[PDB]
Amino acid sequence: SAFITFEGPEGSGKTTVINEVYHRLVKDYDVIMTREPGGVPTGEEIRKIVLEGNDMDIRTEAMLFAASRREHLVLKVIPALKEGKVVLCDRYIDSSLAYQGYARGIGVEEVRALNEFAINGLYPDLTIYLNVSAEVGRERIIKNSDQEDLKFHEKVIEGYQEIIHNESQRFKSVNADQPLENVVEDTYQTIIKYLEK
Amino acid sequence: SAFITFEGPEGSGKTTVINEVYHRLVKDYDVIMTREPGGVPTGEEIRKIVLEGNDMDIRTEAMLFAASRREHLVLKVIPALKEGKVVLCDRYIDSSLAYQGYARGIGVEEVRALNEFAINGLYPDLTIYLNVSAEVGRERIIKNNRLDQEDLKFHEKVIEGYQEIIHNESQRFKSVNADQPLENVVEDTYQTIIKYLE
């Protein structure tokens, strides 16, 4: 079994990468791909409280997303790992840290403690970080589709840069400034190299 | 202003105490009585998920009690404190510590870190602990019939948990002997609060 997460800011090509990588991996591996809360009823119901929120405090939101993360883990991720499957997950604890912790200003130490309570030691075996520069990410966001949004996008990237260099062993960084075909290829090769050892 | 919480296991006479202490304090103080979720929409929605839960993982449950606590603190407790009011709260952080941390076995430190993220430094100015023995509490719970072993043990653990919390802390905790008849429990609690308020 293997628990693989995919991380990156928006404009990193994350959606295209996970989908294309998952498609190639299914041919040879007992692999599943899941997008948190991945249709888990309780997880989806918790998520709805946030989404229906009227000017919801960011900490309440973070705690509800952490509760949803855990329901997804206990009812979907853990049973698939116990069945010996490889699990590809579209976002996980590093997202909460870069977005809620760093970018939204709750604090790194606080969001990490929250994430650690939700995951109870279940860290990914491998995390693919889609390493995009703020400028390439910006052009991809525009190409696919504000000063405050640009600054927030820069803080998310800065947050990921701080995280990645603190847990180097788990993290495998892919150059996401390349065309998406190369980003997909490098990610696939990185995962295969991990799965074959 | 003053933020006063009331803690105790079931059978400590907590409901009677808070209500009777509220009816006495209202004569002289701009005081409110609340509990989580306390009509707060998001808190009420969180409560429904917890009540509809089929063998819900204890950590998910702890995170949901923490999210409800934050909603109730920001939308109800903090605005009343900013108005200069006396806020009496039935159960707060210490309940999660004794129930989720100790009795459920998650770990008091882990549950404390979760609840500190939830409360963001907003600790009660005063916490009344209704100190009941497991045996007196048991007899009160039965009155509301013999209580099964699972319930008796869980009740004993909650008490053990509260004993650990009160000992490893204090300076906000004021313990009231809840083994006394409820009239005396009410009187001691009232006197404790008045001495604090001045």
Ligand SMILES: Cc1cn([C@H]2CCCN(Cc3cccc(Oc4cccc(C(F)(F)F)c4)c3)C2)c(=O)[nH]c1=O
């Ligand atoms: C405040 C609190 C209470 N309890 C206990 C106290 C003894 C009674 N139980 C069971 C119970 C009874 C009635 C309603 C209920 O559901 C609640 C109560 C408060 C808050 C929520 C929620 F909004 F957080 F979900 C649900 C639970 C909960 C905990 O285990 N932890 C806490 O943080």
